[PDB]
Symmetry: D3
């Protein structure tokens, strides 16, 4: 209702990285999965929401808008403003778009319409194309949905994690 | 062995698209790329050339570490990326540092790993995807002989 | 009227610098004036507007909001959204706040109210405090004015440059 | 010569205020500083201490090159920054690398240049200026003996 | 083919010598190097090994871009740097990323350019020149088979 | 007191060896160093001088933070590094920022720590170890007076 959703995001990959890092969900170790095969770099800080389980068996992915990147493993208390939905070779994948919680410099961003269109297009473009040069990888759908849909998915993923 | 000076405008890894104004010598930020992409190699142009697109001939230089915008690198050609976009031809000569024995094993286009050539091609095909009216009609790699003939023609057009 | 003001800014100091660089207006050489005496860093990319002369004998100062810093000497075509007015030991100083011209990712910033308040406060704080530990330096006034005042000052400075 | 391990949370030059959660060991971004300031030295806390503010005792470490967040540095105290803010005391122990002969000339607070001590003081006085209700009542530098006694007291409080 | 996890302690280009404390898993600053030198490759150790020096077996990993201290990289051996210094034997296994086809052309020590191997050797021969009581008696490159033998020795010593 | 403008060519920490072409003022990449070493100070030359080697007189500048290639720094001499190599004499003037009270404690060569002077020497003695036909016969530090004498010699040769 009036009480806004928040959660902790663990950042795995800082904005501007071509190294695709992963944080192990059991040990907390950071691993280099791979150097990307395309001349692309992560459009925002990238990671996952703590204590969630998405429909793909992993913690629910998160994209965080920041004034300055963090590094792999760093926690950021964040709030959702939208969600990126896609289908690739492994099926559906959802990524929640967030901003820092309790920071007045982000109060103007409350929903997906508050983010410049070209910035959302840029984020989409990354995920549509970053595996273009990897064999057997493809994208069949990609689109943006609003904060309300994002929050519904976060709540579902909290429930799956508890179960 | 052909050799020429390349002015690097954009270091490898940059999303800021720097451009030298050829009238004045100043470095300008043309744009922050609209796509989440970064230049796959150090990028610039060959000094004292005039290409078919009316500008100096573009050049890509393979390096172990990027330089700064505006830096000259003595280079030699090993191939060329030939593309056609909405405006016509837009050739980019692929080079390595001249006089450096660490690059002697790279003499022609077949000596550059396919993974690297494919990533360079991917960059130029897609980097303007989000700009209206921009698209790429053709994009192919050609050999050193092809590169050298084009450099020679562009040198002559600069002198004329 | 309907045709928006633009100009070229030469950036002297990238955002986040404690090295205070200057671009020579005759030679175009970059000089290190000094390392700042305070633990502060330039809040935005900082420089001056080409072909202007402010009331202090220098080209009119400019602050440029960017997604990523440039380096000293780089030109950026920009448009004004406001102006910072201050008085220090050398008298009045004015600094025009700008965003990149023709970039739709900045269309939402048209005037000084479109910049988050805390971000304007942060910029002010820099100029109020960065010379705190330098002998004989002080600030007696600092405030923000709108795009219309900024444009009037830019126009005056263009006129002074021509004269 | 007193020696202890400092966990660096924030490298010199950072506007991101990282903080170790002492319950879990994780690194958290507490905030991006609201002022245009940057940590004047590598900054963190002394392991196995419990200060008067209920938290581990804060430490500043002078280094020739910053480390990464979470890195341990064996350090020895040369002085202490004593402040009083709206909540009470908030001491910060000033240290140099232990066992490193390049720092042997720094033994007490008088051996650190005034310019550096003044910049550190300026940071802690002003960095929360734009946060409502935050202000600094007192801020002074004290010597190694003062630092050592406070470290010792904080070690004992951690054991109790 | 043999592969293992390498924990990188020191990214390429560093003059800070970081080390993992193998009891805790914490990263520590051992020291800032005394020479104007920087690690020529990402540097670390192979997880779940015990070298004859009593530490986990050292590893050098060739990469297109460096990682952060503490990062795991799945790697495979292509050779080994054998050194004898003041404290006796020292082996460092040279590796490339495992399961990455961009490195398939590197199968043994002869596939790494001599200029890179010479630079790596030069680092380890000279980086402790300005530290007292340090010297190197021998420094030599051996092939993949010898590297794999030492990894297996070190796996067995870890289990014992 | 003597002071002059130094143009910095190479920031501290660089393995790219940049040089200004003194006819044009352009920055050029001479080469990527063949050794795993990095410039220990910001490095350049004194404007409007002519050394006995026929180039502008080299300068090393101590700074709290490095600059960019091409940046001017007003500096004053505190000593000089004298070297004899394959091409004969080579002098490099050691400097600090002029008019900056944070450097007033450095008036002569004895005011710079031996660890820093030794590291600087080590760089110039070893950075060309893996380039053929290079060697150093002598490398020695001299005081401010000798440095100032050489600056004056080089000012006179520029005018002549
Ligand atoms: Mg998936
Ligand atoms: Mg997922
Ligand atoms: Mg072209
Ligand atoms: Mg003024
Ligand atoms: Mg002014
Ligand atoms: Mg405290
Ligand atoms: Mg070992
Ligand atoms: Mg050993
Ligand atoms: Mg030795
Ligand atoms: Mg010379
Ligand atoms: Mg010479
Ligand atoms: Mg030699």
């Amino acid at each position: 209702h009036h009480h806004a959703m928040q959660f902790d995001v663990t950042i795995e990959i800082p904005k501007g990285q071509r190294n695709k890092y992963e944080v192990d969900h059991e040990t907390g170790r950071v691993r280099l999965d791979r150097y990307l095969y395309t001349p692309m770099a992560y459009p925002t800080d990238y990671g996952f929401i703590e204590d969630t389980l998405g429909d793909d068996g992993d913690p629910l992915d998160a994209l965080v808008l920041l004034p300055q990147p963090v590094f792999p493993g760093v926690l950021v208390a964040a709030r959702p403003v939208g969600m990126f939905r896609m289908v690739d070779e492994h099926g559906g994948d959802d990524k929640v778009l967030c901003v820092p919680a309790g920071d007045p410099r982000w109060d103007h961003v409350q929903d997906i319409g508050d983010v410049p269109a070209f910035e959302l297009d840029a984020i989409k473009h990354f995920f549509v194309h970053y595996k273009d040069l990897e064999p057997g990888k493809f994208v069949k759908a990609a689109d943006w949905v609003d904060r309300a849909e994002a929050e519904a998915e976060v709540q579902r993923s909290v429930e799956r994690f508890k179960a």
